[PDB]
Amino acid sequence: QTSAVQQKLAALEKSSGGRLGVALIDTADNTQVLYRGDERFPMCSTSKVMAAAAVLKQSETQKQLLNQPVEIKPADLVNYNPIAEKHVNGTMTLAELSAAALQYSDNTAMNKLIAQLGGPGGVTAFARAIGDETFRLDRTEPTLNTAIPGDPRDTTTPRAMAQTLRQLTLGHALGETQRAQLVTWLKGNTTGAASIRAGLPTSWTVGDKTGSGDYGTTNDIAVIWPQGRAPLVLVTYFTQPQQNAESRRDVLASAARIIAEGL
Ligand SMILES: O=C(Nc1cccc(-c2nnn[nH]2)c1)c1cc(-c2ccccn2)cc(C(F)(F)F)c1
Ligand SMILES: O=C(Nc1cccc(-c2nnn[nH]2)c1)c1cc(-c2ccccn2)cc(C(F)(F)F)c1
Structure with a gap:
């Protein structure tokens, strides 16, 4: 079946020229709304949530892990390092790296999280351990x-990422203190006001992680606390056919607005 919401999302996608993927979980009733929910999309920096969460999981058995100093060398800097560049020839703790990766989208910080987990496959292994096979x-x-x-x-797919984001932030994939820390970090994101949050009523509270890349890829994953009702989890992924395409955060906002109107 195609719902009214899915037909609106299809119209938005058609006008945009790109490929849009949406997954909503409404935790009030556990119902889901999907659009291309089982197609794969490049995660870009939305993957930083999985890396930070994997380190939070490690910290459950190491009380001092988040305070461990990690060296930042000049050779470590990549292409977007607003926080790490201030620490070159010094150190950042794993908490500081997690906060920088999540709230500023710092790519050097992300690489230190990946290295702490033993490489990209260590992040995938954590995903599998929390039930994400995608x-x-x-x-x-x-x-x-x-x-x-x-x-x-x-x-990943929108369906898989929404389920994982739910388990990490609202469910029991992490210990209680670690879940709360992840939610605090997401709610303090600096990069998200033009994305999912721009399509929602202003009274609603949002924590999110954005991503972008080549092919005009523009992504956001969010946990949303609407005024007076149980939280929602929303993934909006968007990618375009030409390498040099411009970012389209407004498309994510428009998808979020359609989702909110359908509640
Ligand atoms: O740093 C970023 N992108 C990047 C980095 C390095 C090289 C190249 C590159 N290479 N060739 N063309 N661009 C592009 C980046 C872009 C954004 C954005 C904002 C507004 C509209 C579109 N995007 C937002 C953020 C953040 F972190 F604030 F969420 C980071
Ligand atoms: O690293 C990148 N982008 C970034 C960095 C930090 C934060 C965020 C962010 N966070 N939230 N939203 N965006 C995005 C990046 C961008 C590009 C690109 C190319 C052409 C046009 C646009 N982009 C290409 C590549 C590479 F290496 F794969 F070719 C990497």
């Missing part, structure tokens, strides 16, 4: 954002 991280920053159409590397 997520795959194959590369480090910045090349995990190449976003080439048809490339399976560094992709």
Whole structure:
């Protein structure tokens, strides 16, 4: 079947010229709304949530792990390092790296999280351990954002990412203190006001993680606390056929607005 919401999302996608993927979980009733929910999309920096969460899981058995200093060398800097560049020839703790990766989208910080987990496959292994059979991280920053159409590397589906984001932030994939820390970090994101949040009523509270890459790829994954009702989890992924396409955060906002109107 095609619902009214799905037909609106299809119209939005048609006008946009690109390929749109949406997954909503409404935790009030556990119902789901999907659009291309089982197609693969490049995650780009939305993958930083999985890396930070994997380190939070490690910290459940190491009380001092988040305070461990990690060296930042000049050679570690990649292509977007607003926080890590201030620490070159010094150190950042794993908490600081997690916060920088999540709230500023720092790519050097992400690479330190990946290294702490033993490489991209350590992030995938954590995903499997929490029941996500779809997520795959194959590369480090910045090349995990190449976003080439048809490339399976560094992709997931909207359905899988919404389920995982729910388990991480609202369910029991992490210990209680770690879940709360992840939610605090997401709610303090600096990069998200033009994405999912721009399509929602202003009274609603949002924590989110954005992503973008080549092929005009523009992504956001969010946990949403609407005024007076149980939380929602929403994934909006968007990618375009030409390498040099411009970012389209407005398409994510428009998808979120359609979703909110259908509640
Ligand atoms: O840093 C970013 N993108 C990047 C980095 C390095 C090289 C190249 C590159 N290479 N060739 N063309 N661009 C592009 C980046 C872009 C954004 C954005 C904002 C507004 C509209 C579109 N996108 C937002 C954010 C953040 F972190 F604030 F969410 C980071
Ligand atoms: O690293 C990148 N982008 C980035 C960095 C940090 C934060 C965020 C972010 N966070 N939230 N939203 N965007 C995005 C990146 C961008 C590109 C690109 C090319 C052409 C046009 C646009 N982009 C290409 C590549 C590579 F290496 F794969 F070719 C990497």
